[model samples]
Target: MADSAELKQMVMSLRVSELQVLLGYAGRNKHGRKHELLTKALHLLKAGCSPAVQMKIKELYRRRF
Candidate 1:
């Protein structure tokens, strides 16, 4: 299994399509916490997202609350 830090880095590096797939998996697994944040990030990414958006997604994922 991947470590949290590694997974975070991987997610940050993914393209929008990959991120959408990850979001789909999160949804399938009922990972609501991740799903909500990922969904928002995916939406932003779909709407002309950039590296800044990816960084924002990573930051959001790292937050505890």
Candidate 2:
């Protein structure tokens, strides 16, 4: 529901667990510190989200911000 940069904004404010959830949904490594998770998520978005990832993002936005 949001643009790439906008998604990054949402991600930055996410809790650690929330970040982990997104990373997991993307099949990415979820074991990391807050900053690493944050960076990873932003990079993932930067690289471009797949349709599946976008779907999860929609739910995440609704459930959280």
Candidate 3:
């Protein structure tokens, strides 16, 4: 519960640079518009995460917001 709320806010607030960096860590391509990047990252987050990747995401989130 509330996963979307926090992740959604993150997606909405993130810059393209940050999004691309996060996508890189997720092993996904980073060539896309802002909406596409957000969708891909949001899906990736909900789909799966490891301790390492999750912490990276959290770090970015903290750095940004």
Candidate 4:
């Protein structure tokens, strides 16, 4: 597992398209998939993903986004 800074760096390096791919994958889950994605995204944030990544993750799963 990457350290917080490293994880943040990795997430920061992603483009919008890459984030969209991640969202699409997360969106494929049926039951509580959005919740699961948010949880995982939170972990990534704690591990140091940038705010942009965190926000994008949330937006992707947002019910009314």
Candidate 5:
């Protein structure tokens, strides 16, 4: 796994368009947890998502995002 700094830089590396598609991905979850969590991650990692994506993104990964 990458250290914080490396991870931060990696975050700079997610495609907005793909993330945009997650809008619905998060949508079809219980109580919309997936969606809300993804949204928060997007907001927090707004400036960083590239490496996150390259590392192989998924719903759980988005939560950590």
Candidate 6:
């Protein structure tokens, strides 16, 4: 996800699964540094992520919670 301008769209509201998929920190053991991705994701999501990402998150979140 940190490869390009994909995160420049704008978003809000997310799911743990989505976070997992994007930042790779859902419910499995990740690298020590990867944990920080959750914080970065939160900071970005609080402001906004990407509408594209948000839609996927919403779609998945809807199914889960």
TM-score for each prediction?
0.38, 0.75, 0.69, 0.37, 0.29, 0.41
lDDT of 3 by residue, 4-59 (tens): 46755755677788788778877889988988988887787778645455555567
Candidate 3 deviant stretches above 4 angstroms: 1-4
Candidate 4 per-residue C-alpha lDDT over 1-65 given as tens digits, one digit per residue, 9 for 90 to 100: 23455444444444455444454554532233444544444455665555555555444445323
The C-alpha local distance difference test score for the whole of candidate 4 amounts to 0.46
Query: lDDT of model 1 at residue 50?
Result: 48
Q: Can you write out model 6's per-residue Cα lDDT over 1-65, one digit (the tens) per residue?
A: 34323332221234334556655422233333433545556555665656555555555556665
Error of 3 at 10 (Å): 1.9
How many clashing residue pairs are found in candidate 4?
0
What local lDDT score does residue 12 receive in model 3, on the 0 to 100 scale?
60
Least well predicted 10-residue stretch by lDDT in candidate 6: 3-12
Off by over 4 Å in 1: 28-65
Lowest summed lDDT over 10 consecutive residues: which window, candidate 1?
25-34
Task: Give each model's whole-structure lDDT.
Answer: 0.48, 0.76, 0.71, 0.46, 0.43, 0.46
Candidate 5 segments whose C-alpha is farther than 4 A from its true place: 18-65
Q: Which candidate is the best by TM-score?
A: 2
Relative to the true structure, candidate 2 reaches a TM of 0.75
Clashes of 6: 0
Selected candidate, larger lDDT, 5 vs 6: 6
Best prediction by lDDT: 2
What's the TM for model 5? 0.29
Per-residue C-alpha lDDT of model 1 across residues 1-65, encoded as one tens digit per residue: 33335445545555555555455544432234444655554554454444554454455455522
Residue-level error in angstroms, candidate 4, position 60: 18
Total backbone collisions for each predicted model: 0, 0, 0, 0, 7, 0
**In candidate 5, what are the lDDT values of residues 1-65, reduced to their tens digit?**
55445433433333444444433343422223434544544554454444434344443346557
Better lDDT candidate (1, 4): 1
Model 4 error, position 23 (Å)? 2.0
